[PDB]
């Protein structure tokens, strides 16, 4: 309805995008950590077997 | 006269090939292991 400045809408939209990107970073970090487990039992992990 | 041998030949004597191993099965095992740990 044109009741706020357009710079306020731009800032809010950019904030949403930035939050999405930060969430992506966190998710990929967690996925990277899970690459070393692969959901196997404790005795099946390579180090314990070695 | 021919007292000392003076000829060469490009063919070996007494070739033995047994005890030479083929590495296919171990390569299959390696592929299987690598595929299991990639997800």
UniProtKB/Swiss-Prot annotation, chain B:
Role according to the record: Part of the tripartite efflux system EmrAB-TolC, which confers resistance to antibiotics such as CCCP, FCCP, 2,4-dinitrophenol and nalidixic acid. EmrA is a drug-binding protein that provides a physical link between EmrB and TolC.
Assembly and oligomerization: Homodimer and homotrimer. Part of the tripartite efflux system EmrAB-TolC, which is composed of an inner membrane transporter, EmrB, a periplasmic membrane fusion protein, EmrA, and an outer membrane component, TolC. The complex forms a large protein conduit and can translocate molecules across both the inner and outer membranes. Interacts with EmrB. EmrAB complex forms a dimer in vitro.
Residues of the full protein shown: 352 to 390 of 390
Signal sequence annotation: none
UniProt-recorded name of the protein: Multidrug export protein EmrA
Family statement: Belongs to the membrane fusion protein (MFP) (TC 8.A.1) family.
Disulfide bonds: none
Location(s) in or outside the cell: Cell inner membrane
